[model samples]
Target chain A: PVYMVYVSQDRLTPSAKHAVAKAITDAHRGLTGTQHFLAQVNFQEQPAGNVFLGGVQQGGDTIFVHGLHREGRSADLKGQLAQRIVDDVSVAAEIDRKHIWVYFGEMPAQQMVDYGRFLPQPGHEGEWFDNLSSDERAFMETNVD
Target chain B: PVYMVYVSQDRLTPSAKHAVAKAITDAHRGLTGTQHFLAQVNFQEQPAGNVFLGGVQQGGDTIFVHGLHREGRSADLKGQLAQRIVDDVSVAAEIDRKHIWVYFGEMPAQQMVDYGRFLPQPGHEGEWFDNLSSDERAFMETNVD
Candidate 1:
């Protein structure tokens, strides 16, 4: 799963970025029981005048979180995941809850390519991890936290 | 509708960015018959070490285009839109077709706020536009393409 967090340029300081990213990763892994490595969070900082809401330009106050998740999770489960993200991000980014919006959409695991292989379906992550080549396993073990 | 194009930093020249964004807007409006201004496109340029594929970092050769669209389009329509995007982005960015990945997810219009009001459902744009305050209409008319 990947979470794309959109904000205006300079809206988030370096420390704020780290905190928000860590909070999102924690939220996804905690709520879904997914591996920490698979929950990727990226911050997309837009240049001035690049962001618009309701046809008008928006500032640093608004944040939009869009997630592309693996399919198979129930709506209720996904809803909880979204809620957790919003709560954690609000505190980490120091933004009001109303200023943040998070939405998750899912695609089949067959459609995702990660670690150079099709992603395993939900609940099959252990099998997928076990099947990685020795070299791939070594890389993951050494590089990923 | 909004399309977020992710590519490595320095991969696309400024001209390439304009071309790709225009191509995407054209493809989206031509296919969906929506207002031209509603087809928003944003490019996110990521620094080196930020993009990974299967646990390995990737360079500028890859492009990922993700769209958040209004619900109600058929699967076929959405698929075609994705195809059109991939084809056009390949041509505009001068990247190989295989390197570009396009995926779209939908949300109900009510879940979206644009023009400072909740968006109307897929087919109700006209009614929504007509109901906008004259100031809102003037701003959109004067500013948007």
Candidate 2:
């Protein structure tokens, strides 16, 4: 499973937040072939003096995204995932691509739990199958292509 | 040690970033009386609607601070540490107490490794003694009251 927090300088409308949220969730799902995760996003509105880039502060909008996920995907997949988020959220939030920052932390599967149940935490042989919704189970078991 | 990401709607100046960073690091050091761990601070500035409170997005400045720390402190200590963050960062960043959201996740020390050494991934007795800075070691050994 993947978990994330997205922070932004834009005061997104409720619908706008939902749009960005869905886009993020979809981007991660597209890469992992599962929607079995959690995401927390907070949009902040501090002055330009509170956000910085390359040692200089920003006066406009900037977005910072941090993710935690089960450690198993190839580096290739992780790169693609970050790029996908940029593509998705830039258009959704109407922010410059260069202003968005997306980073991921590879969490050891052994330490994760979802809703009082352990899914894969890197378990072998259909170990996570039991904890999924029917759709999730079906997707991971059959549609990960 | 601890890791943190601060997301805001207001862009921070380079100096303000330094101030909050110092305050955060100091908060942890004050609690643990040691700097035997690594700390990462990323200031993410995004919009107001993009940040939500009770599902309602506002078009004003807000601060969200998410921290990752090794598990060991008492509940009481953690509470003080969080309050300390709110008090310190609010003043330094010039934001309201209600506008600041501080959160911490306790990570099992055994599950972490840093700089190729385990520092204290919960090591016993001498676990953190080896990596402490002269100041940190002296503080942990002396003034941790």
Candidate 3:
């Protein structure tokens, strides 16, 4: 599963981009009850007019989020994830919450690949947890499923 | 199907993005032997620090493509389609051809949807083709299978 948030930056700097990415990634983990995958959290920064919404060129008007994840997830969780990401962008990037459009594309369990292997395997899940340090594991267990 | 292209736009303007989108879409149709339904062409433009490849920053170095399409097409056609998209992009966006990495994700027919309807439906396909105008019909017949 991946959470890709692309912001239409008119003159947004690298610092802002990095912050928003981190904030959104944190929000996604909180909402989805999943540990953070930093590599999978791609923060795409497109210049104004290169990104669009309602067929109009957006400048400070939109943050387009395209989330790619497993197909089987509760609707409430999806909504929470999207909204939390929007809220983060609104606060961190100084964009209006109303303008953000988050579109999620659901893929099946075996359809997604990461680290050269198909995902959602308990083996990979164990590997992921093992890769984290004790502090991370504590936080992950305390906060997420 | 999905044709996800992450373009490293160090200095790519709106026109360049549109050009690559059109080029990729055209290549998809040309090689797939049919007009497609939103392979979700993410004109994903990432800055120097945003896009990464093998843990290396790809700025002015690569264009990453992730194509998700239906199974059953021959490997030759798939290769042709992916390369055709890469070539068009390298020409249009002034990127190096060697830096492009295009990968395909094969999806089952029942797993995809368009306009909220399941894909690979002959009934829907029949309706789609039947709804075409005389000119569109002739062109589609001449080009697609």
Candidate 4:
């Protein structure tokens, strides 16, 4: 699985938001054999919104995406995703690409299990149990049936 | 003097910075009795460097200003400033007029006593002492030559 994160410093505008949403959705539209791809966006308030600590202000925008893939981990995949987003959104919103920060990470099944366990899950007991390590599974079996 | 603050959701480019600075300086250039009209800008960061704290990627910019006279405050001033900046910089830079947070206070004459006492020459103390407040004068007379 590959997880990607993008951070941008652009004011939140209706147009800007629309542009971003379209870019992400479009980028993933034609990918082959891609399973469980998820994209999440968060907006940070600027200036006096208390979104940031301290009084310093340097506004920007960001995007995050994670996908489970069955094929090779290719560098071209990352570039393609980034280029599409930047090209589609930057011109429309008049935002610059320099302000965007991008990062990627690869997770193995063991790490994925660990990651899932660390996340909050309220009513998904089965899902959480499925992600346990072998030793943890034995412990759960003995203790919780 | 007038004071203004500008906020942006993105990190500013050189051109954008210049545009904003020029706009503010030009607006207040010939205003009478304005000793130090100023504009301050704040930018918000996106993707939030501190993601562990629920920081998201949405961010915007802000602009603030205050005039010496309430009459000197005008929407025209703000509009012109925003327009000029957008023209000079990226259209994505968001600028808005915000309320002024001002502090009003009065200084007592006795506050000058410490300054006088810290002056260069002790022999010139009498001259400096002449400028002290009545309260400071009586205090000084009782304490020293």
Candidate 4, B1-145: lDDT as tens digits: 1222333334455455444444444434423222111112222233323222144532443333322222223466545544544443333333332311222111111111121222213124346557756764553343211
For lDDT, candidate 2 versus 4, the one ahead is 2
> On residues B1-145, what C-alpha lDDT tens digit does candidate 2 reach at each position?
4334445444556677777776776777667665422343556555557877788877656777877666777888889989998999998888889888888876444333332223364325264665545654443333121
Candidate 2 global CA lDDT score: 0.59
Top model number, DockQ: 3
TM-score of each: 0.59, 0.51, 0.54, 0.29
Better candidate by TM-score, 2 or 3 = 3
What are the lDDT scores of the predictions, listed in order? 0.74, 0.59, 0.60, 0.36
lDDT of 1 by residue, B57-141 (tens): 4455767777888888776676667777777888998886655656666788879876577777776778888898999877767
On lDDT, the candidate that comes out on top is: 1
**Model 1 regions more than 4 Å off:** B1-5, B11-43, B47-145
Score residue A20 of candidate 4 by CA lDDT. Answer: 59
Which one wins on TM-score? 1
Judge candidate 2 at residue B123 and give its lDDT.
28
Q: What is residue B29's positional error in candidate 1, in angstroms? A: 20
Ranking by DockQ: 3, 1, 2, 4
Error of 3 at B89 (Å): 15
Interface RMSD of 3: 9.2
Rank all candidate structures by their TM-score, best first, as comma-separated numbers.
Answer: 1, 3, 2, 4
Interface RMSD of each: 5.7, 11.5, 9.2, 23.9
